[PDB]
Amino acid sequence: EEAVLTGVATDKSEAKVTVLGISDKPGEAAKVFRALADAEINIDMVLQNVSSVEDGTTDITFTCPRSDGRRAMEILKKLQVQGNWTNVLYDDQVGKVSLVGAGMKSHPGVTAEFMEALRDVNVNIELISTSEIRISVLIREDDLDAAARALHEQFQLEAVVYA
């Protein structure tokens, strides 16, 4: 019944790449990911939100090891010019911080307090993604310490019940 938090994880070893302006039609994500998979880019997370109400296109962001970042840009910039994408952006100064746990679905206060914790130390949340075991956000790598510390304080974190 309860949500249980088992840890706060930080990762400063990734880069994120964003492909902007993809038509929201079948097969467009396949074009991006077949190119990357053929180049052996080790993808950590992919995030694509719903397509825009003003343009109908959407953006796709993914993280990968920083050592894979320049190659992924090379592959994608080639694709960029052949098709109708707006642009491809690179960022190798991103940090990932995650609250790890279980049973968070029925406790929305866990999500609210994760955002409040980072707001209270002025850490801007650049990207959010979640799974069955984690709330993960991408922020400036220089804010990883303030962020992880704020989360440990917010949830009074070895494993803890959300209260």
Ligand X SMILES: C[C@@H](O)[C@H](N)C(=O)O
DSSP 83: S
Closest approach, Cβ 150 to a second copy, in A, equals 11
Helices (H) and strands (E) in the chain, counts: 4, 9
Residue 118's CB: how many other CB atoms inside 10 A?
21
Where on the chain is the footprint of ligand X (CB under 6 A)? 22, 24-30, 48, 58, 115, 119, 124-125
Q: How far apart are CA 105 and CA 103, in angstroms?
A: 6
Residue 11 bridge partners (DSSP)? 96
Site track for a second copy across 33-62, x = CB under 8 A: xx-xxx-xxxxxxxxxxxx-x-----xxx-
User: What would the two tokens of residue 84 be?
Assistant: 């109708």
Q: Which is nearer to ligand X, 56 or 67 (CB)?
A: 56
Q: Which of 131, 142, 149, 161 binds a second copy (CB under 8 A)?
A: 131
> Which amino acid is it at 8?
V
Provide the binding-site residues for a second copy, judged by CB under 8 A: 16, 18, 20, 24-27, 29-30, 32-34, 36-38, 40-51, 53, 59-61, 86-87, 89, 105-106, 108-116, 118-119, 122-136
